[PDB]
Amino acid sequence: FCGSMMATGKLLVSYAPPGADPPKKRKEAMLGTHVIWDIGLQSSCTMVVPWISNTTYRQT
Amino acid sequence: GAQVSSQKVGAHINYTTINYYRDSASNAASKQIKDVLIKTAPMLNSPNIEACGYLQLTLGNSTITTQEAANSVVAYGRWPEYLRDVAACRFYTLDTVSWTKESRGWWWKLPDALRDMGLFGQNMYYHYLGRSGYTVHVQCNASKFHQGALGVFAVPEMCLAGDSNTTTMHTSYQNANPGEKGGTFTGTFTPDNNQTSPARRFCPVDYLLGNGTLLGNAFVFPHQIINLRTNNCATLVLPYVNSLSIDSMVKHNNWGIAILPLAPLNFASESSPEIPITLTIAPMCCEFNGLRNITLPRLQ
Amino acid sequence: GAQVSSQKVGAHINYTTINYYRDSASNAASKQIKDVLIKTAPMLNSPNIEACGYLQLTLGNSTITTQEAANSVVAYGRWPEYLRDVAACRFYTLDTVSWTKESRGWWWKLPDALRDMGLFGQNMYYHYLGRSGYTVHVQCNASKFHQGALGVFAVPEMCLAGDSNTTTMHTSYQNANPGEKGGTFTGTFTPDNNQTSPARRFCPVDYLLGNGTLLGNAFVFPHQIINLRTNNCATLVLPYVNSLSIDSMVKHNNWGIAILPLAPLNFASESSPEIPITLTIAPMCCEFNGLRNITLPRLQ
Ligand SMILES: *C(=O)CCCCCCCCCCCCC
Ligand SMILES: *C(=O)CCCCCCCCCCCCC
């Protein structure tokens, strides 16, 4: 977050494993793997997208 | 079998008792520092995730990132636990509401508010019985130039008052159960006068906690305060509370979440400000029972 | 590091080997009574719930009452097991079909046939990945004066042939996946000649197992026979079989259930008899993964 110190807010970061309609709304993103980021408290935020696949490896 | 014991005395000798009957019910009633600031019964006073011995708050794939924690409370000092002797139960974020200079307050009911949340909701309607605890995370940020205070109350068996003055206990199942949507508080009682075709719904007056008791005393209930000055979020850890070990989630709501402006929202100088309040709730240590065909309610 | 070993000899001396390369792939190929009636590799021959060491058959609230059991088989000698290193998974009874003097046969696919079965189906569509084994219980009774024989075949990766002779591998997802309903076999190949607006579906010829191979050899697959004379039901215990530990249940069907009249239904003297065949199937040792918003397929 490269905004100002006086700025505050909460964002939701999400990861949805394949097989359904790609999320167009918070309501559905909410349902998958997610993190809630508080901008005001800390400037940066990390989310790990854990390896979840049917196949052993994926193609490039 | 005569029972001898110390008499209830002043502070400057005893009495005798014999039980005449076989059933204990027949028995007479058996009658039973340094720092004043300390609570006699802490748990009755709203402890912290900290204060009983228990940041990234995570359930299944869902996860809260929280510094705020002295701002948490474990209802009745009791942590959620399995009916003793699952990733349908995770964090669900409900539709965000808006706090304004004229909001009187908001209410929700559990499990009701979660009835349509993914596999949780499904599990609820496919089973006769279900039990669950909850983690309620209220989110509400503003600037250092904004001001206001939210009172977040978790009420056990939160029965609310109805709109009618001609008939009682008459709020319809549909109206009593708003789902995620919410349900809201009002500043004044407005009796549903339409006799013939009744509204059949609640009329919750704010200063009376929508139930005939004074809001100022709502703090005897598991609660937490969001003071815009000091903190932007509150976390309530709620145990399964009931007169039963397990019950019908469809017929009965265990907990009520009430959010009221203890101190009105204000900003810099704008005549009419606004800020969002988002509720993220997760069911805990949860379990279901008595599987069969699905319940299809007439919610309308 | 020279490796010396016994030469492949007749029956009335050895050779030497050295590996020149770092990758095993580079390596040369390394080449490796009393009662004849005994099987070299039994498991490849369709064992019983009995024959590997393993009546009321029960899963969750669901339960089969069975004397019939010598009539059971554990596919590939392998019992269902958890992806190692739940009462959504129980017995579901599908829509009953009717066996007549002219039926050519029936087919179903797993998980597909179970896609709408209570919480199982839900779990399937809310997750990216899922795996499961199955207990297939085929039910079909008649009288001591009826006759006939059903061949119940469990086929791994049961790819079926299509209706077109102008284009290949073109059966639509919708048509390939019938759900519980079924899908049926035919006595003759009828090429979908409608060029412009293609039927895009399977055309499964019975004597060719709907896949280009002779039905008479279908017995190399995990199977069981219902001979109306001797037994009225068959039970197949199916393991999760795949080139992967877990996969997409929505994109891919693991097992195929094929039921064909090895010997035609006949009764007393009625020119046209009928008897019901009911399939009750239960998912086993089952597990799901990668929860998110629900999959809403275009099944039509
Ligand atoms: C223990 O109780 C033994 C001593 C009992 C004293 C005997 C006199 C009690 C008279 C009342 C007993 C009959 C009441 C059912
Ligand atoms: C074990 O291998 C030690 C004895 C090896 C015999 C030496 C002659 C082998 C010549 C081939 C080695 C070079 C091939 C990469």
Residue type, C121: G
> How close is the nearest chain B Cα to the Cα of C73, in Å?
29
SS3 B149: strand
d(C-alpha B128, C-alpha C93), whole Å: 21
Write the CA distances from B116 to B36, B178, C120, integer angstroms.
Answer: 48, 11, 18
SS3 C183: coil
Q: Is C35 exposed, middle or buried (0-12, 13-18, 19+ CB in 10 A)?
A: exposed
Provide the token pair at B158: 């939160």
SS3 C213: coil
For the Cβ of B26 lying below 6 angstroms from any atom of ligand 1, the answer is no
Furthest CA-CA distance within chain C: 78
| CB-CB contact of C256 with C108 (8 Å) | yes
Q: What is the sign, positive or negative, of the torsion defined by CA atoms of B172, B174, B179, B181?
A: negative
- CATH number for region B46-300: 2.60.120.20
For the Cβ of C20 lying below 6 angstroms from any atom of ligand 2, the answer is yes
Name chain C contacts of B126, Cβ cutoff 8 Å.
118-119
* Residues facing residue C224 across a β-bridge: C152
d(C-alpha A58, C-alpha C176), whole Å: 26
CB contact under 8 A, C295 and A19: yes
Residues 36-55 of A with CB under 8 A from B: 36-38, 40-42, 45
Q: Given the CA of residue B21, which atom of ligand 1 is nearest to it?
A: 15
Nearest CA to ligand 1 atom 13: B20
d(C-alpha B263, C-alpha B101), whole Å: 10
Considering only CB atoms, A36 lies closest to which of B61, B65, B144, namely B65
What is the Cα gyration radius of chain B?
23
- The 8-class DSSP code of residue C247 comes to B
Nearest CA to ligand 2 atom 14: C20
Residues in Cβ contact with A51 at an 8 Å cutoff, skipping those fewer than 6 apart: none
Task: Please tell me the number of Cα atoms within 13 Å of C296 on its side-chain side.
Answer: 5
For the Cβ of B1 lying below 6 angstroms from any atom of ligand 1, the answer is yes
- The 8-class DSSP code of residue A3 comes to S
For the Cβ of B4 lying below 6 angstroms from any atom of ligand 1, the answer is no
Q: Which residue of C has its CA nearest to A50?
A: C290
Q: Which residue of A has its CA nearest to C252?
A: A54
Total residues belonging to chain C: 300
Q: Where are the domains of chain C?
A: 1-45, 46-300
For the Cβ of C37 lying below 6 angstroms from any atom of ligand 2, the answer is no
Q: Does A9 touch chain B (CB under 8 A)?
A: yes
| CB-CB contact of B260 with B204 (8 Å) | no
Angle at B19 between CA B17 and CA B21, to 5 degrees: 160
Provide the token pair at B74: 């474990």
Question: What are phi and psi for residue C155, nearest 5 degrees?
Answer: -100, 120
CB contact under 8 A, A8 and B142: yes
Q: Which residues of B147-184 are buried (b: 16+ CB within 10 A; e: fewer)?
A: bbbbbbbbbeebebbbbbeeeeeebeeebbbbbbebbb
Q: Does C69 touch chain B (CB under 8 A)?
A: no
d(C-alpha C99, C-alpha C88), whole Å: 30
DSSP B207-219: GGTTTTS-GGGGG
Name chain A contacts of B64, Cβ cutoff 8 Å.
36
| CB-CB contact of B56 with B65 (8 Å) | yes
Compute the distance from residue B17 Cα to the ligand 1 centre, in Å. 10
Nearest to C99 by CA among C155, C146, C161: C146
Q: Which CATH number applies to C1-45: 2.40.50.100, 4.10.80.10, 3.30.40.10, 3.40.50.720? A: 4.10.80.10
Nearest CA to ligand 1 atom 6: B2
Q: How was this structure determined?
A: X-ray
For the Cβ of B21 lying below 6 angstroms from any atom of ligand 1, the answer is no
CB contact under 8 A, A52 and C129: yes
d(C-alpha C222, C-alpha C78), whole Å: 11
d(C-alpha C157, C-alpha B258), whole Å: 55
CB contact under 8 A, A54 and C244: yes
| CB-CB contact of B187 with B9 (8 Å) | no
d(C-alpha B262, C-alpha B44), whole Å: 21
